[PDB]
Amino acid sequence: VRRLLGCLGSETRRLSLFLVLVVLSSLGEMAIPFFTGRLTDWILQDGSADTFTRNLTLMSILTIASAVLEFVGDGIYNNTMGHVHSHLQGEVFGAVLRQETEMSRVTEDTSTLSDSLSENLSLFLWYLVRGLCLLGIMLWGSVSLTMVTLITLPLLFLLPKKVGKWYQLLEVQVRESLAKSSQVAIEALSAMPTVRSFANEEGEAQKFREKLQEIKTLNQKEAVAYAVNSWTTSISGMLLKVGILYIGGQLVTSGAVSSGNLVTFVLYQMQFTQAVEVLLSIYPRVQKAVGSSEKIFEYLDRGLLTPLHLEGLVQFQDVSFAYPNRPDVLVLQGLTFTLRPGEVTALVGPNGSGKSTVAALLQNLYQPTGGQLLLDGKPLPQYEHRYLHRQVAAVGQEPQVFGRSLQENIAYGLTQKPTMEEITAAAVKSGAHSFISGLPQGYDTEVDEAGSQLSGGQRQAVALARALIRKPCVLILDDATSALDANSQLQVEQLLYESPERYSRSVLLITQHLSLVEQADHILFLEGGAIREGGTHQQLMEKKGCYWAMVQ
Amino acid sequence: KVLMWRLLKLSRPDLPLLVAAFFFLVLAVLGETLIPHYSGRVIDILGGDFDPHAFASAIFFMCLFSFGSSLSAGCRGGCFTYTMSRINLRIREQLFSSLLRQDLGFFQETKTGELNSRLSSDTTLMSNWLPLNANVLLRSLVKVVGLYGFMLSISPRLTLLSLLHMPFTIAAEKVYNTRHQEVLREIQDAVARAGQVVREAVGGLQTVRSFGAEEHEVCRYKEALEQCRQLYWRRDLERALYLLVRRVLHLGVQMLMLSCGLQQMQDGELTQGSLLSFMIYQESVGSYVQTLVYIYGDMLSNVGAAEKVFSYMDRQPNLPSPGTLAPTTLQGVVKFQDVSFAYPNRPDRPVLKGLTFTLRPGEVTALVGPNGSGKSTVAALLQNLYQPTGGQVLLDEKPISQYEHCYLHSQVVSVGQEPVLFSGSVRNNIAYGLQSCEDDKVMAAAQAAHADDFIQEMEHGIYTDVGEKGSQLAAGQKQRLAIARALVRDPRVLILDEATSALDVQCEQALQDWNSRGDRTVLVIAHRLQTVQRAHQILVLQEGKLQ
Amino acid sequence: LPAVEQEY
């Protein structure tokens, strides 16, 4: 039923020993009052008969063991708690990433639910054993007072909860109404120019006061219930302290128990009061943590080829594409495009008409919405994920680089990091080294996180440099022409065409770049989800195609 | 600092509670410090005799005094939590009022998120100083002084041992209170870095999934998390060790404590009843003496928060002195001479440069030219929101600053391209700002703005509610509402900005044909040439200069 | 681990 205990299987032996250390410490602490009754009785009924030395010695040793065995006790707990706590975080993070591209809050709650449960659970274990073992020795002193103590205990359990229900309702109501009152003020402040324009600066003050008077009358009921909540706890604690003493007095005067036995119960009962109160206080907190943490378990329990470079062959057969939002969000269909090594191509079409999905589909990041497709004559999932990812790479629709130096930011995912100078050399080839050399340490200077070190002018060249670092046999791009200066990007496409990679590799970029428009060896375009155009811009215009119609 | 004095002075209007509550505090402390004294007295009387006359009397008074303490504790606590409320319900009223007197440039720099945290959350800390923090300190301090009096009453030879040991605990407490906070921030910095790793991954995941690069992301997190685990383990290990030294130091008293007491017990000047009162005194003093030094940290936090609020309380606005003139009638003539302005947050870039132009009640003036939408400053300058850095603007040949603030905006109104609306009924938004308006007057204004033609579809007509910031209504409907908001005020100088967004020429001509535009000055600002069909004069704005 | 004030 409950799933919160599923992770305890990896360290069962550690916790079992921890329980043994807790019970050992719990018994040792009880010696402090138990002897206190015994020495007091010994001296009132007998002289300085040297019996106190042996009795007192046991008091020191037992409590020393409790403190020492406590420290060795919890120190094992948290050290082992952190080790499993660490594993839990990585797996939960390791699970969320394993999803589509269609969020950090999921790691935030487990970041605060774990510590809330892990600390409170230790407190409950300590005090429950201490509470249990306190009853074990307290029952060995007098069977009459113990029965008295157990009878009055539920009143402390019950009455504060009944009264506390009245408070916890009112405090929430005040707090939520206060948020509403403060929220109205922000609505005026956020639209301040309009307020000053219409001279309602006094009206907003009046409207704010009106919402505060409604809270003032509510507070006058909040304070009244505070006395009864305080009066309930204080009287209940009192009414047991007097009760045990009086029932003790009749018992001891009857001769059944000695005066000292009553003394131990006085100290024992006082310790019990805080033990039950502390144990009950943390119960709502641990209850909230375990109940809320069940939501995390939804996320937790949610090929032969190893290419170093792609073979260049690609094909399609009635392929279809759709948006991740819903199956009815199909944006492409009837795709039959094919590719071969050495082919240079360009793509264009309506925004959102499956162009982005096709690029993602070509990278095997998402399964086709229909039809069939293959790469190098083989299915896309027919290769190892890391190797298939290294088979072909593409520049994303939003060119950016990670928060790392240009000498190492391009080595992501690669099994062999290239040389830092070679990384700088790749930046020179892509032209990013022109701005990269202006860094505080050139290529060695770390770039800002999420590509914040430079604008789109250098970001587009950075994406090309990252692709140039891999230098795959199959390349692709989507909307890369709108990220930086057109002339630099057009020359970059021309540089790729003039490079010897024009025979050792192939590429197809979905962008309206003029250089790729005129230098394309082939092209294919879609309209309304189906293929409806292709070829070079000049060739299509000569053939009176869509390019010629665009001249209107 | 002296800042505590102003915070203290603020609570003086609530004396009929503080004085009474402080009386109950004394009656609660005295009622509590005496029950241990009678507790030992009962067990001492119980030994060596069977005297109900002494036993019953001892129990009765012990029951009475603790009962009085318990009743006073509820009353003492009850009064202060009410005083905390009335402090919180007074600062928020005053703080909000002070903010509304600030200049517009102040709100351009300050973000609403900062102010909301400053107002809604931080003002709670401004109510926990006197009602809560002053108490725990005073309640504990008077108890510790009183308890040692009863300590001295029992056996002077036996108190001195507590006085020697106790400073050792506060020395350990002082070290631990600072040491664990220092390490806690060391955890926090590592934790913040771990969150940053998550933030980077989630914002650019499409780059990551282009490769099997998810391995480097978990390696990023697993090693940052590894630092957290090591830093975590370092902290609670010290907490556990600090617990041990304090726990064994408890034996440093009680082991020694009984040795002197039992030796004294046989020798004299002590009885078992007298001892038990001391025994339950000792472990209570250590708890309160630790709390007393503990609460001082919260003293600085709440007072430290006071510099946040009172900074906005005392910020002197830079607006000119409020105007006083209010003529019976206005001809609505506006003239400009060499006016120039720059934003306070973006100075030394004059958006407008030495402008000069004049408007008349019987004509219509149109403003054209992109200017990077810098022509909007004329709309803001005319309503006396900002101030002309150079030159001055004269309305009816008078300095606009001399006109009373309430009266001025009852004659000159504007409608920006962004129809800002407030939560509440439509009937409330149309007549916004006015002290009172008849529903009959709104109907004519609603019809004049052609807004009544669609609002009647809504429930209850004009009294239909509107979502916050106009979330419930459409933009085309929102523009009409703002138009009615201006037409209902019977203005003499109208300012319409980018009316071509949803209002056609015929819709705009209706506004231009009203009593506020039929013989009153109206300024229209747009980018298209459609304004040339009816504007009397044309001003083109290029690079902050009119040609 | 024992307990480590909010009372007014």
Numbering used by the authors:
A (entry chain A): 173 to 274, 285 to 484, 492 to 741
B (entry chain B): 135 to 681
C (entry chain C): 1 to 4, 11 to 14
What text comes from the article?
Peptides destined for display are first delivered into the endoplasmic reticulum (ER) by the transporter associated with antigen processing (TAP). In this study, we analyzed the structure of TAP in the presence and absence of peptides.
To investigate how TAP interacts with longer peptides, we determined its structure in complex with the 14-mer peptide LPAVVGLSPGEQEY (b35). b35 contains a proline at position two, which is thought to render it a poor substrate for TAP. Nevertheless, b35 is presented on the cell surface by HLA-B35 in a TAP-dependent manner, suggesting it is processed through the canonical antigen processing pathway. Densities corresponding to the first four and last four residues of the peptide are clearly observed, but the central six residues are largely unresolved. Conversely, the C-terminal end of b35 makes stronger contacts with TAP compared to the three 9-mer peptides. The carboxyl group is situated within 3 Å of R210, forming a salt bridge instead of long-range electrostatic interactions. Additionally, the last residue in b35 is a tyrosine instead of a leucine or valine and forms a hydrogen bond with TAP2 N262; a residue known to affect substrate selectivity.
